[PDB]
Design a protein around this ligand. Structure first.
Ligand SMILES: NS(=O)(=O)c1cccc(F)c1
Ligand SMILES: [Zn+2]
Length: 257
């Protein structure tokens, strides 16, 4: 099955997921000079004060911190969005080296990692229904650069030893995702897709302009995770990113000039 190796990586995905060659695939390169400032774009409204984290899971492709999405506890609204999108999980994509790891790029620049806070449109009732809709998901993407530590990331880093291998999960309650945000909520936005199979074209992407900084030790700990299950040959979970895809008939909009 699909992964990030030479034999099952992004160049192979189209054989099982033909939408890989579709009209609104993600990620993309954000060419900052050609992105269009849209003065009609509203500020983002990130309402995470009542978030209920539940668990952290290694799914063989990344690790997901999962939330209770059975009520409007942690929601995203405003920006380019109509209606209310509920936080279901966040995860990261990262590199084997500090010079790569992000999925989106900015003027071809790669960051060390990229955080995705995944939200689904509550008019569709559940996540499974939402991914079948062109406006089903909103993913808030945040770049990570290596520099100073992100204190709000440390609780995540410290639990990774308990979910080293595929299929492992751990309780992960009372985590506050507000501690993962940068200061500014300035963003770019464009219509796209899931960046992993099934590659569904259901995502309004909202990518923050300001990266967060994490420490070398924090990202090193991501790199100690495994793609494999316990007792299978060890393969480090690194370079779990899809490269930039053609923009095709899309214009990236900016909330700022
Ligand atoms: N990487 S991502 O597009 O945020 C993504 C991929 C697959 C499932 C999902 F909920 C989110
Ligand atoms: Zn992702």
């Amino acid at each position: 099955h699909w992964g990030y190796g030479k034999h099952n990586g992004p160049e192979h995905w189209h054989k099982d997921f033909p939408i890989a060659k579709g009209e609104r695939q993600s990620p993309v390169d954000i060419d900052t000079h050609t992105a269009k400032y849209d003065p009609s774009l509203k500020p983002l409204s990130v309402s995470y004060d009542q978030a209920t984290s539940l668990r952290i899971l290694n799914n063989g492709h990344a690790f997901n911190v999962e939330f209770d999405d059975s009520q409007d506890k942690a929601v995203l609204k405003g920006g380019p969005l109509d209606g209310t999108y509920r936080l279901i999980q966040f995860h990261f994509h990262w590199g084997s080296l500090d010079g790569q790891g992000s999925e989106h790029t900015v003027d071809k620049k790669k960051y060390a990692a990229e955080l995705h806070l995944v939200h689904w449109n509550t008019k569709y009732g559940d996540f499974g229904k939402a991914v079948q809709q062109p406006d089903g998901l909103a993913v808030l993407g945040i770049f990570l650069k290596v520099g100073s530590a992100k204190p709000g990331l440390q609780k995540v880093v410290d639990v990774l030893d308990s979910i080293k291998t595929k299929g492992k999960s751990a309780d992960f309650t009372n985590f506050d995702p507000r501690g993962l945000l940068p200061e500014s909520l300035d963003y770019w936005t464009y219509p796209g897709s899931l960046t992993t199979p099934p590659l569904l074209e259901c995502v309004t992407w909202i990518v923050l302009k300001e990266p967060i900084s994490v420490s070398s030790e924090q990202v090193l700990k991501f790199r100690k995770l495994n793609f494999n299950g316990e007792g299978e040959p060890e393969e480090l979970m690194v370079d779990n990113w899809r490269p930039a895809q053609p923009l095709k008939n899309r214009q990236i909009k900016a909330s700022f000039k």
